[PDB]
């Protein structure tokens, strides 16, 4: 079929459990891409489901701050997902290397995530697994764009309707409503932005225990803090935005629209 006839593979970029990602070129276009090549043979039932979902959901979204799916091909034992080429690695790896971000950069970064999140919510998509691992830098350049990735756990919603979509996501970034087993929707992604923003500024996360069942109580109680002295030189409008994102009640939590209009980002 048409991967062989349309595209040419080049170097290894990353390895998965059942997937490899390799730089490729749509030949008659001469445009380069990231081909995630997935051994469909090795995949389980729920793994297959997530792949179909990931392909349909990604294809709904077209935003500079979202890793675009351009194509989707199948070959008996392999599915090929043709994505944006991205050379800058994960935001996680960039936070460790740089340890924390200035308020300025932190603002410029969370800005792009929020716009991407806004597009998702405007397209009736909720990511559910927002974390620095799933936020990628376009290139090694010192102003490279941030793009949202891995929609394997993303879901479709009808307007502002909440429903029990299941327990899913990463413990550090799970919203209180998910953990309470309440119906949920768009606001979970804005909770995840709170935790990501908090990490950008001081370089460590607001919710952690070695004991997972205590971690989940810490999240549900809204039990985060701004310890002295490191937070004493952070601005109250930075903390204000965060407090609005880490609101326990999704109903009272700030939306992506509202957060983009926050002075800390607006100005």
């Amino acid at each position: 079929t048409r991967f062989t006839e349309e595209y040419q593979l080049f170097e290894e970029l990353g390895k998965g459990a059942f997937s490899v990602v390799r730089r490729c070129v749509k030949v008659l276009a001469g445009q380069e891409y990231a081909a995630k090549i997935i051994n469909t043979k090795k995949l389980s039932a729920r793994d297959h489901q997530k792949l179909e979902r990931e392909a349909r959901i990604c294809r709904l979204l077209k935003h500079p701050n979202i890793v675009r799916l351009h194509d989707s091909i199948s070959e008996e034992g392999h599915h090929y997902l043709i994505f944006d080429l991205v050379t800058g690695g994960e935001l996680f790896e960039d936070i460790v290397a740089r340890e924390y971000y200035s308020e300025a950069d932190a603002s410029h970064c969370i800005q792009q995530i929020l716009e991407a999140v806004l597009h998702c919510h405007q397209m009736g998509v909720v990511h559910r697994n927002l974390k620095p691992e799933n936020l990628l830098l376009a290139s090694k350049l010192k102003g490279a764009a941030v793009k949202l990735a891995d929609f394997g756990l993303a879901i479709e919603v009808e307007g502002e309707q909440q429903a029990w979509f299941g327990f899913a996501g990463t413990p550090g970034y799970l919203s209180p409503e998910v953990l309470r087993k309440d119906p949920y929707g768009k606001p979970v992604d804005l909770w995840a932005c709170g935790v990501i923003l908090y990490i950008l500024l001081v370089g460590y996360p607001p919710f952690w225990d070695e004991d997972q069942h205590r971690l989940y109580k810490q999240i549900k109680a809204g039990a985060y803090d701004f310890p002295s002295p490191e937070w004493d030189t952070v601005t109250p409008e930075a903390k204000d935005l965060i407090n609005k994102m880490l609101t326990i009640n999704p109903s009272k939590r700030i939306t992506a629209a509202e957060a983009l209009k926050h002075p800390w980002i607006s100005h």
């Binding site: 756990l153 327990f167 990463t170 413990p171 460590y204 952690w208 310890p227």
Partner: peptide, 12 residues
């Protein structure tokens, strides 16, 4: 302070 670590996704 709390440590920042790579964390894995639940799917259930």
């Amino acid at each position: 302070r709390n440590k920042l670590r790579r964390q894995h996704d639940y799917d259930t």
